[PDB]
Every structure is written in C-alpha cells, then in structure tokens.
C-alpha cells in the first residue's frame, strides 16, 4: 500500500511572544538548520516521499518559500493551511483530498526524534497496513501530553489527554501512523472542554476497536521537545555535541534522500554549490567522497 | 546637544544558511526575546530615544512589524533599509537626513552586552559633546575584529581592521558614539580592498585627529556576539542561567523605558495586558509592584 | 587589616553520589577547583590570612590542593567542622585564628563575577565597625536568607528560609564583620534545625543598629553549586566568558600578581609544572601581556 | 564461560591541572553521579560481574572507598596500580592474575556511551567465543585515536594509532573485547616511539591473524568522551537533558544490577535508604514500583 505523510506545524498562539513575534516557532533554527527539518528527516526515514505541510495562513507561504514542492530532495510537497487552531486532528480534515484512499502519518512540526534503529522502529509502524500506530515514551512530566496507561501484561488499556492524575509515565509522541478509517474517525469528532479536536479521541477510537498499537519508544531514544525557550536551548546544545563529536549532522533531509536512494550524486552537488561557502554545503560535499555506515 | 541613536541589523548573506532561510539572524529571539531587543536597551541606556533601524531591504518591513514607531516604549523609531551590504559606515550616509546637525550613536543589530554600572560606562561617553569614543575589550581572536594597540601609557596608538597579525587582544565593540563630524569623515570615504565603507577608517579618522577615546570595556562585562551557531547557542544560556538566577530580565525595553521614567505605570500594565498568560506579561506586571535597586 | 574564612563544609549526603569521591568544594567549576573562585574573591578583598574549614575527611585534601599558601603570597591555615552544626560555628572554631582583628567569612561553593568588584568589596572591607552583607535579586528567596527592606530602603528585617519571604532579596554567601562576631556566635543557640545560624549573627548585629546592607546589583553574577543543574550551569557560564575573552575569571595566581603579592619571576616557576597544559600557558601569557 | 571485565582509570597526567589536582578524572561527576559509574554500568550491561579497577597509586584506594567490593550491587570488585602511564595495552600484564584463564573485556575509565540496544550491541560481542572485538564510530577528529580503515567491501584493513593522516574518520571506542590470546600477545608487546604499550598493536596482532570483528557503532549512539574541560562539560549538559526530559537515569548502577537480576527489590530499598533525601536515593525508591519497559 501507500503512506502519505502531514507534518502539522500549528501556532504556538502568543505562547512564547515576543520571542516569536518576528518569526514563529516551527521557523526557527534548531542549532544548525530550521526545526521543520527535523521532523520532515522522520517521515523521509518512514519511507514516506509526499508529505502535506499544514500550518497557519500566516506560516504557510513561509514554509513553502523555505521548502518548495520538494523535487530537489525527491519528495513531493504540497501545503495546507488550517485558519485557526481548532486541535491537532483537524489536520485530517483539511488533509481529507491529499490523504484519499491511502495510509497515512502525522507528525508535529517541533518534535525532535534520534537514536539508533529509527529506521526499523519505524518500518513496523510503517508495515501495518490496518489500524494505527503510536509511540509511548517514558517522561518526567506526562501531565503535560497524552497518557497510555499498560496493563502487567504491557497491554495499553487506556489514554487521557494530560490527565491530572496521570496512570503512567508514559506520553505519546508526536509522530502517528494511521489507516484508511481515520478521516471519517475525525469526521465525527466533537470539540473537547478547550474546543479542540483531540487526537487522544482518534487515538482512543482505534483502541475501542482494539486496532491500536503502542510500541516503546526505549530510553535510547531522544524525543525532544520544543516547548519553552529553556528546551529549545536544551535541543540546540544537544544536536550541537553530537554532531560536534561526530561530524555528521542530524535529521539532514539532503543526505536522507541521497541515503534513501531518491537523489543521486550529481543532484546532491548540484544542492550543495549555493551554500559552498558555509559548513552545510562542505558537509553535503563530502557525503559524495565518503563511507558512512 | 541632542544624541541621536542609530542601529545597523545589516545582513549576515547566506553564511547562516539554511537555518536563517526562512527567518534572518537580527530577528531571530535570544533565549526569550528578539535579537534586537538587546542593542537596543543599550541605546536606551545610554539615554537615546531618537533611533532609525537599518536593515536588508527583505528584513526592514518586519523590525517596523515588531517594533512600530516606537511611541509604546516612549522612543521614537524610523527606518531605512541598506540595499547592498557595502560596509558599516554607511549607516552614516543612509542617515544622513535622520542625524541632521546632531550628535549620534551607532550599535550593531547582533551585539549584546551585560554588566554594572552599564549606564555609567556608556553616560561618560554619552556626556562628551566633541570627538569620537569607542570601546574596546579583551578577545580570544581579535583577528576577526577592529583591533586596537596601546603603547606602554595606555594611549590608543593605532587601529586595524581584522589583522592578520593583531597588535593587541583588544577588540574595538560594537558601539560606537559621535560628533557632527561623522558624516562629512563618512561622506570622503573610498571602499577598501574588501569592497567596504569601513567604520575602523572612520575611527582612525577621529584617531589621526587626536578625538578619538578609547574606553576599555572591562573583563567583568560579557560582551558577546552571534556569529556562529555555537555562539548564539553560547549567547542563549548565558542570558538563561542569569534570568533563571535572578528572577530578572536582561535588556527588556519596556522595563528600560519605565525605569528611565519614559513611559508610567498605566501605560507598562497596558503593554502588559496582551502578553498577560505568558512569562514575559507576567514580568511585566511584576514590575509594578516591587521595588528591584 | 582583616582576617579570612573559607568555610567549605560538608553538603551532607544531598549531592550523593557525585560528592561520595570528593568534597563539593574540591570539584572544578570548567577549569578550576570551586574553591578557587572564593579564595579569589577574599583575596580581591585584600585579605591574605584565611583559614580554611572543613570536614576532618576533607580537611587534608585542601591542604594538599592548597599548602600554606605562601606560593601566592597568601598566609593559609587549615582547621576542621566534625559535625555540619550550622555556617556561625566557623567564627567558634576559628576564635583563635581571627584574635582581635576584623574578619570576614565566605562559603567555599559561592561563585561571583562582575565589573568593580574590587571596589564593592572595598567598601565593606575598609569599614572598622560593624557588619557588612550583600543582598542580591533572586528568584527562589526562600532557599537562602531573605533581608527586607522598608520604603526608606533600610534593612527592617532577616529571616532564614522564609516559608513566605518578604522580598525576593538573598543575602550572599559573603560576610564582613568587625569584633563583635566570636562573642555573638558563642552566645546563639542553635535553631529548630539545629544549626547555629548565620541569619542570628546578622540579625544581632541588625538589632544593634550595625549591620550594613549594601545591594549587589543585577549587572553581577552570583552564582551558587546547590545542586548538579545548577553547577552544570556555572561551568558553562564561566566557560563562555573565558573562551570569549581569552581571560580566566578567579585564577588565584592571576589575582596575587595583580594584587603585587607575588612577582614576576614567582610567576613564572608558577607556570612552569602547569606549562604543557592551558592553565600554566595562561599564567606565562600574563608575564607579557598587559591587561586593563 | 566467564568474561571479566577492566576498567583502566589511568592518569591524565597533568593534562586537565589544576581542576583534577584534588582529585583523578574518572572521579568527577558527569553530571548527578561519578564518572567511573558510566563505564562501570557498560561492562554490567554487557554481562560482566567481575571487574578489576586499574588507577595510579594515590587515586586506586579512592575507587576502593567509593566502590567497595561491589557486593552491594552484586559485583565482585578488585583493584590494581598502574604505577606509570605506559600505555593502555599494560592493562593485560598488571590484570594477568585477575583475569586467569577466562575470557576479557577493557573499557576506559573515562568513556561514556549512549543509546538504544545497548545490551543487544554489547551482547554479541560478549557472546564470541574467540578473536578480539571492537567498535567503530564516526568522530570528527579521528586524529586523536586509533583509526580503523575498512576496504569496499565494508572489511577492516588497517589500523593506526593517532595517524598525521588518518586514513577514515572512524575511531576505535574505548571499549575492547578478547578470547583467551590477548594476555599473551600483550606480554610479547615492545613499546612505540612515544614509550607506550599500545591497545592499537594488541588489536593489530589479532587483525593480522583474521581474528578481529569491527562493527560500526551507529551514529544513532552517542560516544561521548571526556578529554577537555570543554568536552566534560557538554557530557554533563548531554546527560542532564536525557534525564530530565525521561525521569530515568543514564548508566545508574544500582538499576542495572537490579534489571539484570543481580540484587533484589529489598537490597535495592537498603541501598536506597541513605540517599533517601536526594533525588538518587527517591530515584531507586520509585524503581520498585514502577514498570519501565
Ligand atoms: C541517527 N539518525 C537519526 O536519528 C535520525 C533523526 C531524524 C530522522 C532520521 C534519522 C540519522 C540517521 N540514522 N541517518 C542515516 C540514514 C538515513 C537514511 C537512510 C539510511 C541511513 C542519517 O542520515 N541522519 C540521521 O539523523
Ligand atoms: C544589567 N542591565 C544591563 O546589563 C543592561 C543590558 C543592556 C541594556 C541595558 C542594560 C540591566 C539594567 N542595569 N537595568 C537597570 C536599569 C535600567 C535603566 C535605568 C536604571 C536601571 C535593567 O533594567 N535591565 C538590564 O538588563
Ligand atoms: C572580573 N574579575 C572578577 O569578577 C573576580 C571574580 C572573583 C574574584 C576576583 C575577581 C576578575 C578581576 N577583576 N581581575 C582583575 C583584578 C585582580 C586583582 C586586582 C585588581 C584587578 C582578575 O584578575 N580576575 C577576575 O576574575
Ligand atoms: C539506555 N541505556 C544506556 O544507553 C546505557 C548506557 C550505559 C550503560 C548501560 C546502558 C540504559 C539502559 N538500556 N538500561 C536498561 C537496562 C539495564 C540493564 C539490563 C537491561 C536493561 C538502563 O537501565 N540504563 C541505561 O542507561
Ligand atoms: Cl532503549
Ligand atoms: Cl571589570
Ligand atoms: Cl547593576
Ligand atoms: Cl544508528
């Protein structure tokens, strides 16, 4: 089958103003390269080339001007705008035409994953052509996210939406792997006490029909958020020492579609030659010189 | 005589590339504000309320978006854009009009600057009616700067634009304050081999006159800039660990503004009231009602 | 004339167990001992005898760290807490080291940078009466002492860890006092913690009328260790300044060849064991280079 | 059937003076808990209870203070002095009797490793029953190393020790693992130009015999390592925002020993008891009754 892909990348509201005033937050740079990189490299390692990219009337054009339609890195990008932020499972309805009939993928615009394996841990998800797949993963502060509480058995039993009395310490992260049934799921939908369409209620449909999974996502694994300004430093300092020590970049869409076998050499130079000058395009040169296993 | 402020947020091309493509350096945030908001508080500081914003002909539009006509803080803000990056002492010449028979002030749009008695530092060299003064500190690579060479008596001597083979540690800042005399020296000069109006042949102009003061900015001040990605990240915890201590915000205008009795306590809880559900409103509000010395 | 303490006692088990191996106060802040930062701050303050107190386990680890000083033109002696029985028992302890002079104490985890620091420490060290103390703006008074002022800004009242504090003001870890303390200090009992406290000997001094408050500003950094998050966040404070400006914040030799204490060619032997390393390559720097 | 373990806690000389002139390097923290923790916890994930502790004669009877005879964590600990730095490969001549006539490992008192199927990366290599194993990963300053160079085909060909012109940019970690051989082919060691006995010629004697596995230790693994202030630094801020994002602790050895079995529930309460009133000991209370998968 299929797999399409949407990155949502809604307002953060005047949350993080006047920080954000200027530019907002899924614009800004992660350390080296824009945050929606970050993401946009997750659903590249999903095995997934057309991705919508949804965010805010403002935002939108900003995005597309940043990314194009994609066919420089051997995606196909188009874009969608959500007029005001009425929740995260909306984004199915505006994406009703872009999904059709295939499987589809959601992940937010300013969540961060890495680790090793990512590429298996998410070819399973990927694999499952009927329900849907998330992700749990231990955190200090599951309040603030969607909560699976597990069984002895490790049988997820139930999810709250940043419950007060959380049942585990496992959030779900923002990267959602769904079937053919989701769009109508959203369709019927009601607003919540905030007046947001909840993915939660997606989420716990497909668990009233004993068609979710929840994979572990281990500790070995950092998913970042950037929700405060505090993480945002937290995530610059952390991309910063692993790709300092190692030479290699993280979530670089360029190398990922080289990797991935959806643009070749002469097309990875032909990218590479604007920024010749600074340290992204001398990195994007040597990956055509050198064995990276 | 009345001292007029001028601030150059000048390009940074494609060397920050592609994490500025979608948003430009000066209007990126440090840590919990704009860029801007920093050489900005040091004009205020100093005692300036006249300012013209200077930036890219693509950047200008959004400064004026983000910080209107000033009127809100009790400034009062212009703006003209350089429509090529062709040197620093250009700001001169693109405001000549807006300077007219006064004297002036010129801070880069990327420098921030922290420590005591600031206002005195800057007051002594806002008080000298006639010549030229600038500062200067201790750098690790002063190559990268204007550098300064005392002789045994402490006596400015000389003064190089990025040396290769530096005379001195001391780099000249930022921050530059003038006399009438800077648009006419402005007005005669011819580019250099790098193709550029430099402000360090402006200052060797004063220099070769005998009106040139140095200043030494001492080591208990931060001086710190935003060249590199490192360094901004640098820049983000250094403010971070000294807000998160203090429970004080470094170079927030509008506390500048009601501390130097610019705007009143109606008008700060009114700039308060629109941000009143995040950190910086509740700042603001904060300030109402404590005494801080 | 004023005698120096360095009370770098124990942080008990709450740093366990990073501080099983060593001493909290033994443990580098980037590139130097922590001790080193208060060592150069009462130094600043002209004072060249200090003694150092600490626990009996650590005690002969500083001495070892440190000698008797007269390397760096400073008089060090060394005497040992056995039991964390609260800061004011430095000046019980020490009754016979500070004899009839002024004195002044500063805890041996307190960080401070900042531009005329020689002058703000001038001030209270030069005084002949009284007591001296700093109030800084925090954002957790509750952790630390609290000093309260009236409108007049005059000090009306001290409270240590205030459930409900009475002004976000914390007084730092860095007390001048003239020969009133020993005789305060022996009279205090100890409190609901059981602790003899310093907040009691400022109070007392408060009560008297004597006790000079002054502010240090927000253009300062004082920093505290207390706990890993934040000793992660001085070093990097600390390394941020040094690799800007290619100059070391509290490098005790640094400070006793501006002071005049030591000279030239001491400074140099000085670099010479340190002279393959960053450090001693610093010191050799400071022989030819002049800095304002 | 056993594998013992080495940790060598060498000297730095006086490399990191005057910060380490108080104490040895491995016994600073990383962060919340002692260095030596984090290569301590990586030989018990790789299965290995009994391990001796090489230091310099005035730090080894620290390690003994701080660590005991492991029996607390279900260890078997011993200790031994190197009395000069004369090379990492010196380990297997002072470890002789230790070690016996079963199988080995050494790790570096100073190395840190991070990331996602850990145990499975550590678990083959522990599982041969012949040749040396060792890892190789992708680093920015091979230079400072030993430098693994494979062929075409993926296969190792070469390794040199710190090389002027490192031949790849993939170092050899300081994690080594041997069959029965290596106490031999280290005694038959002569030292290198700079008077060291080299894990680089223990590793090349096995090579030149067709008996050493290279896998790649992925770039979804942090290695960090300790060798700057700089570096130490950024490990401690690496690990901070691991831990505070998760509520779990990297490399805690009380919890290896714990989920390998090792110690149980009540000797896990016991050593929890004096911590009780830090965040390590609640730490250890809170893994009793939670399930963490
Ligand atoms: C280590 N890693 C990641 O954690 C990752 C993060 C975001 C998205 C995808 C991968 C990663 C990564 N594994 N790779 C290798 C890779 C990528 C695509 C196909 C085959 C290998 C990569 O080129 N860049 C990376 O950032
Ligand atoms: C400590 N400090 C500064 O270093 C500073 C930095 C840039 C611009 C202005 C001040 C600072 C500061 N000194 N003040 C106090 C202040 C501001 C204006 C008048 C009188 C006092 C402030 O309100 N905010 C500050 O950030
Ligand atoms: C900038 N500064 C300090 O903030 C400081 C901090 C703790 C202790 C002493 C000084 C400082 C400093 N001002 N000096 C200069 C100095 C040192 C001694 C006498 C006069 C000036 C220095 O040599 N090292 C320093 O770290
Ligand atoms: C995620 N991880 C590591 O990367 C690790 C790092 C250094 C040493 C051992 C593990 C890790 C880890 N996988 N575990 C789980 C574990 C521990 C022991 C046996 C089986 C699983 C753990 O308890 N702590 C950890 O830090
Ligand atoms: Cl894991
Ligand atoms: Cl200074
Ligand atoms: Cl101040
Ligand atoms: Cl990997």
Same mark, same amino acid.
């Given at each position: 089958?299929?797999?399409?892909?949407?990155? /949502?990348?809604?307002?953060?509201?005047?949350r993080?103003?006047?920080a954000?005033?200027?530019?907002?937050?899924?614009?800004?740079?992660?350390?080296?390269?824009?945050?929606?990189?970050?993401p946009?490299?997750?659903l590249?390692?999903?095995?997934?080339?057309?991705?919508?990219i949804?965010?805010?009337?403002?935002?939108?054009?900003?995005?597309?001007?940043?990314?194009?339609?994609?066919?420089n890195?051997g995606?196909?990008?188009?874009?969608?705008?959500?007029?005001?932020?009425?929740?995260?499972?909306?984004?199915?309805?505006i994406?009703?035409?872009?999904?059709?009939?295939?499987?589809?993928?959601?992940?937010?615009?300013?969540?961060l994953?890495?680790?090793?394996?990512?590429?298996?841990?998410?070819?399973?998800?990927?694999?499952?052509?009927?329900?849907?797949?998330?992700?749990?993963?231990?955190?200090?502060?599951?309040?603030?996210?969607?909560?699976?509480e597990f069984?002895?058995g490790?049988?997820?039993?139930?999810l709250?939406?940043?419950?007060?009395?959380?049942?585990?310490?496992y959030?779900?992260?923002?990267?959602?792997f769904?079937?053919?049934?989701?769009?109508?799921?959203?369709?019927?939908?009601?607003?919540?006490?905030?007046?947001?369409?909840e993915?939660?209620?997606?989420?716990r449909?497909?668990?009233?029909?004993?068609?979710?999974?929840?994979?572990?996502?281990?500790?070995?694994?950092?998913? /970042?958020?950037?929700?405060?300004?505090?993480?945002?430093?937290?995530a610059?300092?952390?991309?910063?020492?692993?790709?300092?020590?190692?030479?290699?970049?993280?979530?670089?869409?360029?190398?990922?579609?080289?990797?991935?076998?959806?643009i070749?050499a002469?097309?990875?130079e032909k990218?590479?030659?604007?920024?010749?000058?600074?340290?992204?395009?001398?990195?994007?040169?040597? /990956?055509?010189?050198?064995?990276?296993?």
């Open positions: 089958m299929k797999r399409k892909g949407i990155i /949502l990348a809604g307002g953060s509201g005047t993080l103003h006047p954000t005033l200027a530019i907002s937050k899924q614009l800004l740079p992660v350390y080296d390269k824009p945050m929606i990189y970050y946009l490299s997750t590249m390692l999903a095995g997934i080339r057309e991705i919508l949804i965010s805010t009337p403002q935002d939108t054009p900003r995005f597309q001007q940043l990314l194009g339609d994609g066919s890195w995606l196909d990008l188009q874009y969608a705008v959500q007029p005001s932020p009425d929740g995260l499972a909306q984004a199915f309805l994406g009703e035409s872009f999904i059709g009939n295939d499987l589809s993928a959601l992940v937010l615009g300013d969540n994953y890495y680790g090793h394996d990512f590429h298996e841990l998410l070819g399973s998800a990927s694999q499952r052509q009927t329900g849907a797949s998330v992700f749990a993963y231990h955190v200090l502060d599951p309040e603030r996210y969607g909560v699976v069984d002895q490790g049988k997820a039993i139930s709250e939406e940043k419950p007060l009395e959380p049942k585990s310490n959030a779900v992260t923002g990267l959602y769904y079937d053919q049934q989701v769009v109508d799921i959203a369709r019927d939908l009601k607003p919540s006490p905030r007046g947001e369409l993915i939660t209620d997606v989420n449909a497909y668990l009233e029909r004993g068609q979710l999974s929840v994979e572990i996502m281990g500790r070995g694994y950092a998913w /970042l958020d950037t929700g405060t300004h505090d993480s945002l430093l937290e610059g300092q952390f991309i910063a020492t692993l790709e300092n020590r190692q030479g290699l970049k993280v979530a670089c869409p360029e190398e990922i579609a080289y990797r991935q076998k959806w070749d002469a097309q990875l990218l590479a030659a604007p920024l010749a000058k600074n340290g992204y395009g001398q990195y994007l040169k040597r /990956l055509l010189t050198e064995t990276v296993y």
